[model samples]
Target: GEYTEIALPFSYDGAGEYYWKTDQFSTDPNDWSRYVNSWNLDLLEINATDYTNVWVAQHQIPAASDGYWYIHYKSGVSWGHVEIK
Candidate 1:
């Protein structure tokens, strides 16, 4: 098992959608029918009304699971993949 860090760039005033899948990546951002799960990231603070320059998300891979994992944005952009063993 191993721990991995996942990060994405954001430059908007709203929240962005993120998705994760096992094994493979998809080209279609709207094609989340087979996504394992979804998450959101806010570009602005609660009291702030501006977009941030850079933002990243980190995820840890559990030792119990072994194989490749894929992540992507809702816009159909593939974030990347990670392998744990």
Candidate 2:
């Protein structure tokens, strides 16, 4: 493989799947807006130790709800970045 896998602090909520526009619901997944982001993984080139933001979302409604999400140093100011959770 050309890459290594590492885990970082993450987060999620119970908002469930939502739409950015209409509510009639379409078959297209593009109609749904999961989260707002500044960076997207469109890697055309990659090297060792490369890093990017990624996400996990639901593809189908589950029969039960599960607590899902992650967070890191949310209130701490020790890092250069404000927070990442």
Candidate 3:
């Protein structure tokens, strides 16, 4: 098992709900059955002026089983994925 951290930066105007999910490697985001666990982003801090809202999140991925583990994020249509060994 290892630690995984995700840092997401978005403009104040672009900010919205953010979350992370773990699942098997796949292209389909609608397949909830493939997901293992999920978590919400925590507001780490804020900056002003030349400011871009900085949001940070983290998770402890366990090594209970080995195969392919993925981290997925969704903030509206804007989303991403990460593959871990």
> Per-model C-alpha lDDT, please?
0.29, 0.23, 0.27
Candidate 2 residue lDDT tens string, 1-85 = 3222223232322222211111121223453444212123322111112222333222221111222221211111222121122
Q: How many clashing residue pairs are found in candidate 1?
A: 1
Candidate 2: segments with Cα more than 4 A from true spot: 1-31, 40-51, 54-66, 72-85
- The per-prediction tally of clashing pairs is 1, 3, 0
What is residue 83's positional error in candidate 1, in angstroms? 21
Better of 1 and 3 by TM-score: 3
- Which segments of candidate 1 are over 4 A away from where they belong? 1-16, 24-65, 74-85
Residues 1-85, candidate 3, lDDT per residue (tens digit)?
3323333321211224433223323335444333222223222111111111222222222222433233323333222222122
RMSD of each: 14.6, 14.4, 13.9
Worst ten in a row by lDDT for model 2: 17-26
> What TM-score does candidate 1 reach?
0.18
